[PDB]
Amino acid sequence: QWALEDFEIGRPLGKGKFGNVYLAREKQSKFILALKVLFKAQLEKAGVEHQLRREVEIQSHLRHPNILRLYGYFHDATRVYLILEYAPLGTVYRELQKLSKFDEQRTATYITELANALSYCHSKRVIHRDIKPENLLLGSAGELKIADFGWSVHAPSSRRTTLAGTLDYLPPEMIEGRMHDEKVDLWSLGVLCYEFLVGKPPFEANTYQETYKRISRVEFTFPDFVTEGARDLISRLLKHNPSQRPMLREVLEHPWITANSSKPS
Ligand SMILES: Nc1ncnc2c1ncn2[C@@H]1O[C@H](COP(=O)(O)OP(=O)(O)O)[C@@H](O)[C@H]1O
Ligand SMILES: Nc1ccc(Oc2c(Cl)cccc2Cl)nc1
Ligand SMILES: [Mg+2]
Ligand SMILES: [Mg+2]
């Protein structure tokens, strides 16, 4: 069906490990979208073909206002192309770099939108496993959309692929290579809530080896300006034992969230 000839390519939107993402326009309809380009030789070398297939299959069948759409894919003997919904306001990562920290109202609102999206995912027993600011995109009204389903799966699970980059958002059961489930995304939700209010993630460190130590021991502390409501929520999410982490309805109904979020559930 689709081929490269059907599109006019424009400015680079971002880079990922394999991904190289461009603004693009389809010729007949003038429809604006994003084209995520992957090199076959790099996919083969890294052995991550199965991850790419999962990304396409999982993300294409989901339909939620806070989840980025994937429309289709094609390929041409050097490259694979994913056709994505274009997010015009960029990444949460970029916004955090601009502002250093978010206020309580911005944070609670982002957390509500995240929890909504994740509730829809978990209702299909889909877990994302790579929630972090570079994978959260902003639509035209400034609303948050989860993206980058390359690491997503169905639960329960072990891990089959090597851990590539940052440990900063992963829970203990994941970094210790044990069995995991839905609750991994709740831990990441706690890391995010902290990073939004403080400007850095709670277990950050100079080396892999010590970051590992701080995560498995759950060693984090709060600066003075973090209020009591935020501390209560974050402390509940960042529990070593997964089963003690709250349900998503409990997050969406937490008093600090309901007091500060400017969106409903
Ligand atoms: N649909 C999109 N709209 C706008 N920018 C995007 C879009 N998709 C990706 N980007 C930009 O490109 C980056 C990498 O895309 P991503 O799908 O996360 O690739 P990877 O799997 O390599 O991490 C994102 O962090 C973002 O900066
Ligand atoms: N269903 C599906 C979705 C994506 C996909 O990517 C490719 C392609 Cl086109 C070629 C080689 C390897 C991979 Cl992983 N192949 C099938
Ligand atoms: Mg990414
Ligand atoms: Mg990826």
Side-chain angles (χ1 to χ4, degrees), residues 242-248 250-257:
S243 52
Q244 292 185 330
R245 293 170 208 159
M247 217 80 256
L248 278 167
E250 299 178 54
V251 178
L252 283 160
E253 285 173 352
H254 191 277
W256 180 79
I257 292 287

Side-chain angles (χ1 to χ4, degrees), residues 58-93 95-159 161-178 180-212 214-220:
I58 298 296
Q59 192 169 0
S60 63
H61 287 100
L62 299 175
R63 301 295 159 92
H64 192 277
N66 301 120
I67 296 170
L68 195 87
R69 293 280 314 276
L70 184 153
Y71 298 116
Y73 79 95
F74 57 98
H75 62 113
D76 74 345
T78 48
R79 293 171 293 261
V80 177
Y81 306 83
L82 306 199
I83 311 170
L84 306 174
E85 172 185 3
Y86 161 56
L89 295 209
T91 68
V92 173
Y93 182 89
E95 202 73 1
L96 197 56
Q97 290 276 114
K98 199 175 62 176
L99 305 177
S100 272
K101 295 179 302 144
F102 301 151
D103 58 47
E104 289 201 310
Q105 298 79 42
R106 190 174 198 131
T107 300
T109 308
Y110 281 163
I111 295 299
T112 291
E113 290 175 317
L114 248 180
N116 287 333
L118 286 172
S119 192
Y120 173 87
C121 283
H122 289 186
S123 84
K124 307 192 185 305
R125 295 286 293 174
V126 169
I127 63 199
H128 189 283
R129 308 195 302 180
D130 198 19
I131 300 296
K132 68 190 185 195
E134 316 96 89
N135 288 345
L136 311 164
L137 306 184
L138 296 167
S140 68
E143 74 279 32
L144 177 153
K145 296 170 185 285
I146 300 181
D148 195 355
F149 281 74
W151 274 95
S152 68
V153 287
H154 286 88
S157 270
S158 296
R159 180 187 31 117
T161 314
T162 296
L163 280 176
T166 186
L167 294 179
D168 279 313
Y169 302 85
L170 305 186
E173 65 269 26
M174 210 149 169
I175 315 195
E176 299 169 352
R178 298 148 44 212
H180 53 273
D181 68 355
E182 282 78 358
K183 291 299 192 185
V184 298
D185 286 338
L186 286 115
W187 170 282
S188 299
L189 194 63
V191 175
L192 226 37
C193 192
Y194 184 108
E195 184 178 2
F196 290 170
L197 295 169
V198 175
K200 60 188 196 297
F203 313 104
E204 190 183 73
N206 276 310
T207 72
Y208 176 105
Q209 288 93 351
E210 143 208 16
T211 301
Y212 179 103
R214 287 194 78 206
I215 289 166
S216 54
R217 295 166 179 191
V218 199
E219 307 171 1
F220 69 94

Side-chain angles (χ1 to χ4, degrees), residues 40 43 48-50 52-53 56-57 73-75 80 82:
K40 279 182 184 184
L43 290 171
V48 288
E49 299 99 332
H50 63 103
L52 188 160
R53 289 188 190 101
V56 174
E57 296 304 318
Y73 79 95
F74 57 98
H75 62 113
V80 177
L82 306 199

Side-chain angles (χ1 to χ4, degrees), residues 36 55 148 150:
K36 172 168 180 179
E55 183 172 353
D148 195 355

